[PDB]
Ligand binder design. Structure first.
Ligand SMILES: Cc1ccc(C(=O)Nc2cc(CCCN(C)C)cc(C(F)(F)F)c2)cc1Nc1ncccc1-c1ccncn1
Length: 259
């Protein structure tokens, strides 16, 4: 369809769709969204009508673009250098986005909802900088870099594979919107992943946050943490004085690559 900002919350994004695939997908989507209920960390279905599917507007856009715009050394070096900072986002704000998504996915997974496409591109930064789970859709190419091995090999999609993808999302957050496995092809992933290859620890990252990521990517789906377990660990970290994601500038500072 076609998405435009509107007012009817009052501010809305509305999907405009003429009344065979699209008709099934629009009906299907509406069906899903009605069953989701309401929570601060999921998108807010305002309503649908026929003369159109509307959700509450998120003024800060999707999380991937938001993370990337925070890369202030690239965006505004004079501000960044003067302030010895690589990001307008603190470690606290970054882990809070991550906790929001964990909180939202715990809510959804307790209803046996399986997302299937968790990635920072599908998270909205909403009112008050509250992260909101969404799904904007997928040539319909498979999101290989976010997918659990069992999804790549057998099309097995569970809460456990959602946790895998969440771990990659966590990696995106910490790396400020870096491309996972940059400089590696998707075909190299089909090969290397079953060999036990995983994303490396970002330089700016505490071992403890890397360890949470690693738990999400266990080969055995059944050994991965639940979203509630992830949430509690993130909550623990956020309560501490300790800074977990280093955003300060140093002489050899480089960002995780994108393009
Ligand atoms: C208008 C609209 C309608 C529906 C959705 C949406 O997220 N739909 C959706 C649809 C599904 C099920 C569909 C899954 N597959 C695509 C089949 C699940 C979710 C869940 F649970 F993850 F949240 C969400 C987003 C949007 N929003 C939107 N879409 C495209 C561009 C921009 C926006 C937008 C911008 C700013 N603020 C809000 N929305």
């Amino acid at each position: 369809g076609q998405v435009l900002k509107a007012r009817i919350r009052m501010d809305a994004a509305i999907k405009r769709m003429k009344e065979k695939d699209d008709h099934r997908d629009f009906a299907g989507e509406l069906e899903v969204l009605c069953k989701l209920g309401h929570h601060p960390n999921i998108i807010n279905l305002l309503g649908a009508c026929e003369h159109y599917l509307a959700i509450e507007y998120a003024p800060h856009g999707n999380l991937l673009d938001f993370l990337r715009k925070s890369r202030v050394l690239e965006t505004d070096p004079a501000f960044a250098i003067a302030n010895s900072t690589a990001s307008t986002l603190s470690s606290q704000q970054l882990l809070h986005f991550a906790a929001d998504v964990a909180r939202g996915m715990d809510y959804l997974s307790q209803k046996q909802f399986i997302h299937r496409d968790l990635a920072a591109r599908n998270i909205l930064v909403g009112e008050n900088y509250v992260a909101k789970i969404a799904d904007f859709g997928l040539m319909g190419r498979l999101p290989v870099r976010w997918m659990a091995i069992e999804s790549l090999n057998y099309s097995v999609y569970t809460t456990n594979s959602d946790v895998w993808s969440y771990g990659v999302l966590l990696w995106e957050i910490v790396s400020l919107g870096g491309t996972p496995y940059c400089g590696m092809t998707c075909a190299e992933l089909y090969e290397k992943l079953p060999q036990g290859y995983r994303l490396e620890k970002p330089l700016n990252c505490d071992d403890e946050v890397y360890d949470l990521m690693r738990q999400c990517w266990r080969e055995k789906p059944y050994e991965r943490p639940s979203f509630a377990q992830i949430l509690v660990s993130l909550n623990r970290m956020l309560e501490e004085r300790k800074t977990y994601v280093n955003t300060t500038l140093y002489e050899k500072f480089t960002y995780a690559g994108i393009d």
